[PDB]
Amino acid sequence: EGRMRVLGIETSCDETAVAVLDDGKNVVVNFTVSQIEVHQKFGGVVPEVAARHHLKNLPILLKKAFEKVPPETVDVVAATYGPGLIGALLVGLSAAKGLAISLEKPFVGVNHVEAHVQAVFLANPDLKPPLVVLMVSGGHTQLMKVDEDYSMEVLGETLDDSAGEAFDKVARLLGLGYPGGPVIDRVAKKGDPEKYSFPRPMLDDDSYNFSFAGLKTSVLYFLQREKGYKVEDVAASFQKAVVDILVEKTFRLARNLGIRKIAFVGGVAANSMLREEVRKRAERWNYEVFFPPLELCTDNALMVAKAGYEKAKRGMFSPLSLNADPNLNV
Amino acid sequence: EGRMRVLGIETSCDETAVAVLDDGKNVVVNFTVSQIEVHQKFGGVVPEVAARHHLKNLPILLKKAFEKVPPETVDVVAATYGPGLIGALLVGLSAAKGLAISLEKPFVGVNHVEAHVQAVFLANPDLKPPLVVLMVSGGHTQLMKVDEDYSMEVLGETLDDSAGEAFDKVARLLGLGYPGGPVIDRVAKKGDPEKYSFPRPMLDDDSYNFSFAGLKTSVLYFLQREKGYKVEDVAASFQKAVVDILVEKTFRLARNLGIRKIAFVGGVAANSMLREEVRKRAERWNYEVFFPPLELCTDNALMVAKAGYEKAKRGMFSPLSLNADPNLNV
Amino acid sequence: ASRHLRFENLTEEQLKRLAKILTENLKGGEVVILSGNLGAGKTTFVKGMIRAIGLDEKMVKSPTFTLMNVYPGLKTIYHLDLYRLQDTDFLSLDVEDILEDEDGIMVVEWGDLFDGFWPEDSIKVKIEIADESHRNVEILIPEEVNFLVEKIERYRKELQN
Amino acid sequence: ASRHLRFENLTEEQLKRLAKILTENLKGGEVVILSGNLGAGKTTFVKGMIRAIGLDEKMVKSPTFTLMNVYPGLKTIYHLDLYRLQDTDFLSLDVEDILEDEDGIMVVEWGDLFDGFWPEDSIKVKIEIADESHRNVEILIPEEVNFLVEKIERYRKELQN
Amino acid sequence: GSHMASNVLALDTSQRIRIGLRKGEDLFEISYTGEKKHAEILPVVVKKLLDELDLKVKDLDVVGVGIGPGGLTGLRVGIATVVGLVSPYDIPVAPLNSFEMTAKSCPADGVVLVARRARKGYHYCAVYLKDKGLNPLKEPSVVSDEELEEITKEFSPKIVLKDDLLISPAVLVEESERLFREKKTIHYYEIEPLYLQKSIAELNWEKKKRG
Amino acid sequence: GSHMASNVLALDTSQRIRIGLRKGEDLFEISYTGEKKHAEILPVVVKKLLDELDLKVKDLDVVGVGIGPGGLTGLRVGIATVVGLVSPYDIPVAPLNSFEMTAKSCPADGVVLVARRARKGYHYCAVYLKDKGLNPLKEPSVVSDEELEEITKEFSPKIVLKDDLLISPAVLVEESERLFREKKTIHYYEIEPLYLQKSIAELNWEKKKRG
Ligand SMILES: Nc1ncnc2c1ncn2[C@@H]1O[C@H](COP(=O)(O)OP(=O)(O)OP(=O)(O)O)[C@@H](O)[C@H]1O
Ligand SMILES: Nc1ncnc2c1ncn2[C@@H]1O[C@H](COP(=O)(O)OP(=O)(O)OP(=O)(O)O)[C@@H](O)[C@H]1O
Ligand SMILES: Nc1ncnc2c1ncn2[C@@H]1O[C@H](COP(=O)(O)OP(=O)(O)O)[C@@H](O)[C@H]1O
Ligand SMILES: Nc1ncnc2c1ncn2[C@@H]1O[C@H](COP(=O)(O)OP(=O)(O)O)[C@@H](O)[C@H]1O
Ligand SMILES: Nc1ncnc2c1ncn2[C@@H]1O[C@H](COP(=O)(O)OC(=O)O)[C@@H](O)[C@H]1O
Ligand SMILES: Nc1ncnc2c1ncn2[C@@H]1O[C@H](COP(=O)(O)OC(=O)O)[C@@H](O)[C@H]1O
Ligand SMILES: [Mg+2]
Ligand SMILES: [Mg+2]
Ligand SMILES: [Zn+2]
Ligand SMILES: [Zn+2]
């Protein structure tokens, strides 16, 4: 057994996460503070966790990790170093370099959005690039290409608000609460998606970039202009606008790059209307499409460990001098 | 040309010395403070030298050295690190390590008395050990063996006063002045060496060690006991006692070790009566004997550079951590 | 006492030019509190500001999720949005840390949600929706930083058009 | 005022035993000024002293040329001889440096040549030639180090023989 | 089993990087000052130091770490790297008060006041009676520029360590050893940084009043 | 040709080993304290430091060296190694007064007295008025324990640096730079150590009188 065991760390934003992964396949430990919270934890004889408290949380998860995984068995240490909050990135990054020195093991700095994409290859071990990925969570709205060697480019991003952010804010406007995506999805089901149009200065046809800020305000304008509409119809009509933008561009890119496989990752990829539209076009133009499971798409250290394993296999290790970069570009 | 150029430093006692030597043969620079002093030096636009002022002298000699010898041509740096005065050794040793770091060249720590012995091999390039060396200056009175590989042991030393020291002090007693060796040699010529005996507790027959303290006092006792002696006769009779001790032991050692070559180095080796006695026995028992020139026998950096070249050829280099040892044992 | 400046009925380009003029003249270590309802143009305002540090508007994203974006230009702009902030801890620590950066420019969407937290010399910018393509903008300049007043009033020149 | 102790007509072995008793009882940071003519037995005295630091007499050489010998035993003895010293510089620097060693024992042959230089608490030892095989020894113990007196006078026990 | 410390690593990242490493009779101090960020220096220097002294982390008897008060980014880097160092072996951790370390790093004795500027017109500060050990005359807190002057009169300003604080790495090692000998060390998952940062939320929520 | 310093090495061996190395925006400080002798440490640490910063000696713009007052053996090692460093390239040398360096290494300002014990009942000492720069109220000299007390009254003993002297390597680098900018540097063959040692010969040659 030339087994490569990789301990991943992720502290880029809100989630503190630690994972251990064997040969980019076998999950040993997959902890997030979200789980430790969202499950009860009456007091303790070991401190407690809270969201976005990376410095005090990470130690906790490491303790847990090492109880299940004896430290000397770790071969490579991997951590997110950007993009995100400098203050948060630094905790994961710095602890990881700590462990490398301590365990006399090599170290891998991982890009958060690249990591997210590994969810596709974790979930589809047989899947071979090239492929196109729509990454479309609350934080991230990005169109990416993965080529034969597993290099990644960003070919489109939001110029303002993410897709998830559009759902969240429009849901507030419709008085539906938070998170916006789910409630709108539910409420739209019983609504007419052709009822209303949402015209606004739309950006370039050829551009693979996104803009949602103007769609947000367009719905506001509508509410303070029109009389006697129904939420179902507004939600449905807005939802249609968003997925129409996302699907057109994603397939257009794939066509022009001559790629035949497309993957969708992140909260918004859950959307039932998006999934239908995607399958329709997939069928018609003969594309393979992939929708990873949801617990892989949310921030976690597994995607980091995978990203790390793949870089380590290729001997692409990071120096101990690696600074966190909040604006890291893939 | 696989030419090895060695810069030597010597600051073990009274003399500050710097030398440069090529392939253990070709002398490039051979400076001693003694020369810089014992030759006039009216003022200057570069500071002045004085005896035993190693810290301020050595810089001077280095300046001189580098004017004749461009520094980058130096291959190895060698310095005495013992035995001697810690305070003095340290200056040479520390500057030498300085130069090694500066020139990115290797460094060799040299033993002062071992170095003295290199005068024999500088002066007799064809000479091959084994040989026996009587080292017999003012500081040093030592019987040494050099074996085939050029290793050295001390097989006899003084247990009190050196030979030169006996001459110096007895000369004071006879009111002849300083240095004692020369004046006694001159004055003894016109004296009877059989006139007086100097009985005292003599140490072991088998021992290869020396003791002169008791011979010193024996002459004192004589002066305050006897009446109407002549200086010539006392000087001659004392001189006979000393060389008789030195020659008996030196040849006895050589015989028992089955060595057929003997070398004499140091001030006292100049003694005219010693040289005669040595040649007599050399002739009779068929020994080769060597008396190096006098400017090689006195403290200087050339013997150091030679000692260094020979260690460097054999890859026996010293670390930068090497401390001065006032009691260094060969 | 603090000096109030009203700009009525600005197009989007005009609102951005106004943000550029404000930011051009900031020395370093300043705080701008961006106030206004959903869709008022807070994020659009920051797209104006970044002109002044020699970057493209492309770089300015909504920090609703990221919480704070860093734009490193000729000066560094720290661009916060506190919309979705539930606790108070992130202000006490992370933001407090940047308030000790005396070279950067901090601009904070929805800063008014935590009105007590900000220094007295903070610049307040309130954006109202006038119609579908115009906004009104009110800027409060504290006395401590009063030199800005002359710089901003000079912009009214462009609006005579 | 300083206390004078005379020992008359000591053999060589007796002189060494006396030097051992002196040195045994030295705490550290002491100076012994060895006085006496050529051949009095100053160097022989030091051969006695070294018994007390657990080394062989073999190690004790004349420092006439070396100027200072170091004997590192249970305590370190610094053994100086100033016979051939022409300047004054070596005292001012090198010896002064060792006077700041508060753990070692300094013993100085011909120390009396530079009588002014030594601290007041210095122990003075004067050796006279009595005959060809006996010496007289006078030791001056300053008040500062007065505990030595009882230790040394106890040696007279051995001399009743 | 239970023995006295031989190998001691301590650092403080609260301002400048300060690293102390004792190994037997050998104590090495290292500091860095420049444009490079803590994350660029601290781990590399720690690794090089350990390597040159032929030391592995597991051979360490205690690790000291500064916990503030100080710069948030710095503290986070320092503490986090320490967590990475010790977590695999549960090596005990000496939490070091950066202001106390500052006070003890001052050659003189008497009454000492330590201050670091916060946001314009405010300062972290503490006052210490310092002789054999060191005793707190007022615990580290936040004050305004005016309220700072109140403190400089209310106590004797014998020494005033202001704004640029010298930390002797030797002192870090010494304090780490002391806490270890006093059984005051803690686990890597029990570290509680001095965040005074948090006090400005309440003191500036009104005006110049708090009682 | 003539440019301002970028690469600056300075050390002081007058008590503990203190090494400072600036290279551009990067300043590294190193100190050693332990049983090992200066000759065992100073050269190895200098070499390692230079190597890790990818620096050769010839690339140095100035070398600072402490010249005393201090321990003879230490000073000799330090100065001698520096001579070895610079001699091949005639790199300029900043002579550093170890007592001044001590004074400047003290965070506070005002009136400062520095003292090191000589032979029992005597002390090297100097008094310094210290604010922007530093001004000598009495130059380093030798005194008895009694005469030391005369000085502690005759001047204000605001800070008293006695016996165990902290030297900040940063301060060594800074002073080296200053002397270099003031064209006060010297050649390696012009170094003149402060040997106060030599004053005890005359002051103890009589009694308690000298005028
Ligand atoms: N005069 C105007 N000034 C600014 N923006 C305008 C104007 N007219 C129309 N708009 C449009 O209104 C939208 C405002 O979006 P923006 O995200 O900047 O508002 P916001 O206050 O940041 O929203 P949120 O409260 O969600 O942060 C943009 O699409 C912008 O192009
Ligand atoms: N009672 C005695 N005590 C000591 N030494 C004696 C005695 N009787 C004879 N001797 C001998 O006298 C000699 C004294 O030599 P030593 O070198 O010790 O004197 P010194 O004072 O050191 O001479 P210098 O003035 O040259 O240094 C030795 O050979 C010693 O063995
Ligand atoms: N990704 C795609 N793969 C295959 N066919 C597509 C794709 N996207 C659009 N099409 C088809 O092509 C049409 C638009 O381009 P079209 O008018 O066929 O010009 P051309 O095919 O020459 O580019 C659409 O109506 C659609 O039927
Ligand atoms: N180094 C020497 N080489 C040769 N012969 C020697 C040497 N030393 C002494 N002898 C001779 O040997 C004699 C002493 O030893 P000796 O009585 O011959 O016994 P043996 O020769 O059996 O050892 C001296 O009288 C001398 O003639
Ligand atoms: N069914 C959904 N339709 C549209 N949006 C949805 C749906 N489910 C979640 N979302 C949106 O994904 C976002 C959350 O994404 P995620 O938690 O995966 O990662 C980030 O936080 O970035 C939210 O904005 C939420 O409104
Ligand atoms: N001809 C001589 N006979 C006896 N001794 C002689 C003679 N010439 C010099 N010496 C002695 O050598 C000693 C000097 O040796 P040297 O100068 O070679 O080295 C040391 O200083 O150790 C002096 O004691 C001197 O009296
Ligand atoms: Mg916004
Ligand atoms: Mg003698
Ligand atoms: Zn993410
Ligand atoms: Zn010699």
Swiss-Prot record, chains A, B:
PANTHER family from the UniProt entry: TRNA N6-ADENOSINE THREONYLCARBAMOYLTRANSFERASE, TRNA N6-ADENOSINE THREONYLCARBAMOYLTRANSFERASE, MITOCHONDRIAL
CDD domains with a match to the protein in the record: ASKHA_NBD_TsaD_bac
Annotated localization: Cytoplasm
Species of the source: Thermotoga maritima (strain ATCC 43589 / DSM 3109 / JCM 10099 / NBRC 100826 / MSB8)
The encoding gene: tsaD
Major localization class: cytoplasm
GO cellular component: cytoplasm
Keywords associated with the record: Acyltransferase, Cytoplasm, Iron, Metal-binding, Transferase, tRNA processing
Binding site for Fe cation: 112, 116, 299
Molecular function GO labels: iron ion binding; N(6)-L-threonylcarbamoyladenine synthase activity
Main function: Required for the formation of a threonylcarbamoyl group on adenosine at position 37 (t(6)A37) in tRNAs that read codons beginning with adenine. Is involved in the transfer of the threonylcarbamoyl moiety of threonylcarbamoyl-AMP (TC-AMP) to the N6 group of A37, together with TsaE and TsaB. TsaD likely plays a direct catalytic role in this reaction.
Enzyme Commission no: 2.3.1.234
Subunit description: Forms a hexamer composed of two TsaB, TsaD and TsaE trimers.
Sites where the protein binds substrate: 135-139, 168, 181, 185, 271
Protein name per the record: tRNA N6-adenosine threonylcarbamoyltransferase
Tagged with keyword Transferase: yes
Cofactor stoichiometry and binding remark: Binds 1 Fe(2+) ion per subunit.
From Swiss-Prot, chains E, F:
Keyword Zinc-finger: no
Pfam family, one: TsaD
Primary location recorded for the protein, binned into one broad class: cytoplasm
Matches recorded under Gene3D superfamilies: 3.30.420.200, 3.30.420.40
A Gene Ontology BP annotation from the UniProt entry: tRNA threonylcarbamoyladenosine modification
Recorded superkingdom: Bacteria
GO cellular component, one term: cytosol
Family named by the database record: Belongs to the KAE1 / TsaD family. TsaB subfamily.
Quaternary assembly: Homodimer. Forms a hexamer composed of two TsaB, TsaD and TsaE trimers.
Function text: Required for the formation of a threonylcarbamoyl group on adenosine at position 37 (t(6)A37) in tRNAs that read codons beginning with adenine. Is involved in the transfer of the threonylcarbamoyl moiety of threonylcarbamoyl-AMP (TC-AMP) to the N6 group of A37, together with TsaD and TsaE; this reaction does not require ATP in vitro. TsaB seems to play an indirect role in the t(6)A biosynthesis pathway, possibly in regulating the core enzymatic function of TsaD.
Identification of the protein by name: tRNA threonylcarbamoyladenosine biosynthesis protein TsaB
